[PDB]
Amino acid sequence: KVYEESLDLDLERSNRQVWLVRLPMFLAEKWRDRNNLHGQELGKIRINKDGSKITLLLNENDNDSIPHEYDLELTKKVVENEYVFTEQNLKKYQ
């Protein structure tokens, strides 16, 4: 009765590929802002057909102040035992 929602961890969307990316200070200062991220186009991820090299190219919205091309260095090709979990508040009535 205290909570009207299940209190069990939802292991339903865990089968979802996710990339952990470390960003430079200049790029992280504008990509982590909560006054942004309106669903616009932040760039495109480019992967070679044979792999072994990845690069993301930003759009022309940077105002010609930062590089438009970046290289995605895979510090760990096989990342293991790392997961992403959320946190939400429960309904307190009924």
């Binding site: 339903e12 590089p67 790392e82 979990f85 959320t86 429960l90």
Partner: protein
Amino acid sequence: YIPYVKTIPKKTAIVGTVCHECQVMPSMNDPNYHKIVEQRRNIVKLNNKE
């Protein structure tokens, strides 16, 4: 056993598993390159204290 433990329930859900770790580094062949170097250089040359 102990009767009371004082848990703090919260709504949680696993929404992905990490498969790759990436390090974004600007390309040295980009025309706008070396502007970040100037910005990086300015970091050490700035004195906030007055």
